[PDB]
Amino acid sequence: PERRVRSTLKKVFGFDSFKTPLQESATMAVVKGNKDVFVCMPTGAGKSLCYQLPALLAKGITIVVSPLIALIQDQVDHLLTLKVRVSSLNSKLSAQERKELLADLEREKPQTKILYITPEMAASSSFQPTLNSLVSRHLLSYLVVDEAHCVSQWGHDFRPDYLRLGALRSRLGHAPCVALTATATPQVQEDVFAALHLKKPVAIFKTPCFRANLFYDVQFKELISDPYGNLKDFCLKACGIVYCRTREACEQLAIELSCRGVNAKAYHAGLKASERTLVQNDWMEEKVPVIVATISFGDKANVRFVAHWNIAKSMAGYYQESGRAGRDGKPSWCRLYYSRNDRDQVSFLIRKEVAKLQEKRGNKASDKATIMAFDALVTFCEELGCRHAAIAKYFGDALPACAKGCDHCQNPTAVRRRLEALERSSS
Ligand SMILES: [Zn+2]
């Protein structure tokens, strides 16, 4: 029972023991296949190893639901190097490759062990009959729902195709379901259980937001004399990402940093399908050490810094973006740059998209959630107190008694006066 898990852990990867006992607590509940489980912890090996382990353990194949296509390839190629039979069904996947795999799942004792899928492909009318041949033949081991908060209409990243998966679990009661996420919002948590129709009750496994290696400091653009210098000075003490709003803002900073010595390259949807995949592969190979990107770039362990030039659309989103730093456990720095003009620029767009929705559909409780998400982040910088403690109130996590890992922990007087300095700078 417990013996099989440890023997299959060190064999494939090379791990003496689990990172946290909560990882074993989650894994054992999945291995059991008795209940439906909810996993909520930061990205990396930890959370993935909770579905990757019982899949090989139990006899059958897994259906992993992840929306990111580029993320799917990053996790299938790393899995293949660990010697596992893994497949990935996406929209870009050709019909010749499709029939090779479509006939594989319908055949006796299929060759592939792990199957990656996007919500658009799984819920589709075309693939719909293929899973029924595994539904009846008992080959459907588990149902994996990565990035679970996209079915919320209260969450920072609502993806509509996530709603189709809702009744899918209630339709297929034969296999247990695992809901994986990082966004620990109580309204979103409750929504995940209801919208996905998860088997009541759900064994919830949650990990704290705080990370010792991360330093969260808030800088203010409205009071900095040389902002481009202040940015490269932070950048020099270090791979790493510099997030911002527009495709032209990152294009500006990619060359504005490069000239100062610290080489940086831009990333967004504006770059070609071949260019996007190239600069992403040129990032891992440290020829692109510093990467300037938008919301589009969402894995590497060595992420020394996550600086936000422009204020993020949501408080939940900022946590997801900044929390990509120091996956290895090594020290990293997460800086947020504030300006009431940049603030207003987003607030105006947020109010413009919401008003366009009301002009077509009408008023909704979900329409208010988007606005309230940004307001939760505008307070994060404009308010006095510890940065890690502000994360704790938003998601509901425990109060982390921090020291030398936050701006308030380093100087609760210098940043304090900087707030009073911001108000007088208006007129
Ligand atoms: Zn602090």
Numbering used by the authors: 12 to 249, 261 to 320, 324 to 452
What does the article say, verbatim?
Crystals of the Apo form of RECQL5 were obtained using a construct spanning residues 11–526, this includes both D1 and D2 RecA like domains, the Zn2+ binding subdomain, and a short section (residues 438–453) of the previously uncharacterized RECQL5 C-terminal region. Crystals were obtained for the APO protein which diffracted to a maximum resolution of 3.2 Å, and the structure was solved by molecular replacement using the structure of BLM helicase as a search model, with two chains in the asymmetric unit. The model is complete from residues 12–452, with the exception of loops 250–260 and 321–323 which could not be modeled due to disorder. The final 74 residues at the C-terminus are absent from the model, and appear to be completely disordered from the electron density maps, indicating this region is disordered, consistent with the results of various disorder prediction servers. The most prominent difference is in the relative orientations of the D1 and D2 domains, with the inter-domain cleft almost completely closed in the APO form and considerably more open in the ADP bound form, with maximal displacements of equivalent residues of up to 30 Å. Similarly, the ‘closed’ APO structures cluster at the bottom of the plot with RECQL5 being similar to the APO form of E. coli RecQ, and chain B of APO D. radiodurans RecQ (chain A is in a rather more open state). Comparisons with other RecQ family structures show the ‘closed’ APO form to be more typical of the conformation found in other structures, while solution studies show that the ‘open’ ADP form predominates in solution. The APO form is believed to bind to DNA primarily via D2, with motif VI forming polar contacts to the AR loop stabilizing the low affinity state. Finally following ADP release the relatively long range charge interactions between the acidic residues on motif II and the basic residues on motif IV (which are no longer shielded by the nucleotide or magnesium ions), would bring the two domains close together to form the closed conformation again.
